[PDB]
């Protein structure tokens, strides 16, 4: 794709910035009065106003522009058809497993790297007179000058709509380099967001050596990225990643299996047990699940003891339906690839039957 002046005049900016084009005025940047500063632990999330000229431009860029630039198959995050299960699937054929993480992935993306990556797909011309270029005008809708990070200048912040696509486009080069490095060693490599998973099917201690870490660090130093030394895992014949267990006993032509730990399913089992023991829905929805109806959210008093009950029932049924959808997604993944343990399949079939029975009982009780 090659975006020209008319494309930005009609498609990218149909009505938001049409006033600034005929008047021959430069496109303004995003001011500090239009972005929120949500905080979560040691993380800062930037939220833009839902009614702003830049939000519509970002959505149009995401749908029409940042969806056709080719990517690398090793990236399985924020891409249509990608999933965590597809991120774990290729490593079932390996006997040794290694995991790596990138420290401050979004905060360390250089803006000039983004500009260079997006330059070939944008025509080199002046959008507004002889003062502002088309590339700069497009790029002013994705960056932000962080008041807390003025030392680093302006960066692409997490919480915007166009950040993941830009991250994938920027990191395509590093993905290609790492894949080329791993191909010669016979190591399967996959990436989800900023997490890298490496699998070795042969009997060797390459993944447990410091040489692999040094090589990955040297590769990542071209674009200024660093690894996190507190999240380095290297094991053999079994690995656990956020409750997903991948096992392979070893041997020539051996196929591993993927299952879920018991701790991964602990909350749903507790909810099912509480529901089968006739526990009030308020306690179930407040203790196990983190859903609570604050009194401030109430707008009109009207009637009191009829909306809380239906709200809690809807939240419970939505939670159960979502977890059922997750389990049947696992079942569909098994049907497509056949890399799931049989006993786990029996267990999840029983759990699905129990969940469906509980949902039917909840619906019948609500109707009565």
């Amino acid at each position: 794709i090659l975006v020209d002046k008319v494309f930005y005049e009609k498609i990218l900016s149909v009505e938001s910035f049409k006033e600034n084009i005929i008047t021959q005025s430069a496109i303004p940047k995003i001011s500090n009065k239009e972005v929120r500063l949500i905080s979560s632990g040691s993380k800062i999330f930037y939220a833009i106003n839902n009614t702003s000229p830049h939000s519509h431009v970002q959505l149009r860029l995401n749908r029409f522009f940042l969806s056709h630039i080719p990517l690398n198959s090793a990236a399985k995050a924020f891409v249509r058809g990608g999933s965590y299960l597809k991120y774990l699937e290729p490593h079932i054929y390996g006997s040794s497993y290694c995991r790596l993480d990138i420290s401050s992935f979004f905060n360390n993306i250089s803006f000039d790297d983004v500009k260079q990556s997006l330059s070939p797909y944008i025509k080199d011309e002046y959008l507004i007179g002889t003062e502002q270029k088309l590339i700069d005008a497009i790029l002013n809708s994705v960056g932000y000058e962080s008041p807390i990070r003025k030392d680093k200048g302006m960066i692409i912040p997490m919480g915007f709509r166009t950040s993941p696509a830009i991250s994938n486009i920027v990191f395509r080069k590093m993905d290609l380099l790492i894949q080329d490095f791993c191909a010669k060693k016979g190591v399967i490599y996959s990436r989800y967001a900023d997490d890298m998973l490496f699998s070795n099917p042969r009997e060797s201690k390459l993944l447990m050596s410091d040489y692999f870490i040094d090589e990955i660090s040297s590769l990542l130093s071209i674009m200024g990225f660093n690894i996190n030394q507190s999240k380095y895992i290297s094991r053999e014949k079994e690995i656990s990643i956020n409750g997903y267990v991948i096992e392979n006993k070893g041997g020539n032509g051996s196929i591993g299996t993927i299952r879920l730990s018991k701790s991964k399913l602990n909350t749903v089992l507790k909810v099912t047990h509480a529901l089968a023991q006739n526990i009030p829905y308020k306690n179930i929805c407040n203790k196990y699940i983190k859903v609570r109806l604050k009194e401030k959210n109430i707008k009109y008093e009207s009637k009191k003891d009829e909306f809380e009950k239906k709200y809690y029932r809807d939240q419970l049924i939505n939670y159960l339906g979502g977890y059922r959808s997750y389990l049947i997604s696992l079942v569909k993944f098994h049907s497509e690839y056949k890399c799931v343990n049989s006993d786990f399949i029996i267990q999840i079939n029983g759990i699905l039957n129990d969940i469906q029975n509980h949902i039917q009982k909840i619906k019948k009780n609500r109707r009565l």
């Binding site: 080719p70 990517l71 690398n72 198959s73 090793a74 054929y93 395509r172 290609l176 894949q179 080329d180 191909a183 010669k184 016979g186 099917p201 042969r202 006993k249 070893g250 041997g251 020539n252 032509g253 051996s254 196929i255 497509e336 056949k338």
Partner: protein, 149 residues
Amino acid sequence: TIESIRVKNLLSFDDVILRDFRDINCIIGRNNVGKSNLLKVIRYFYAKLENKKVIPLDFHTNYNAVGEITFTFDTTRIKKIVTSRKNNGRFHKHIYNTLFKSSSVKLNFEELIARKNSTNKSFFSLTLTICKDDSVMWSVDDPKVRSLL
């Protein structure tokens, strides 16, 4: 008796998997190029199995660096034949040492008995990788296994 054929990033394939084969599998369609590409992939794999010098296949896209061909063989009847106490021959013992030796010495005394000797189906997986510099790599580094397969 092949069970699964997987092709990733080769010719006109991005990620194509064929399984559940029957005796009289029939292929129809309008895209004859796809059938020709599948035939070429199979012939290339079987030529590389027998150590023949052939031109590597092309890539669907140049934004990747690998092309993989995966084959799965159902080695169930051969395992039953070899592991029987009645058969004492050179070929049976050689087959056991080549196919079922490495994968069986890493198991304890619980999985071997009453867990893999009743109805289980044994599978053997072989992967061929083509790099960007026209280099060919195997998942198993043993020519004897490839010759026996």
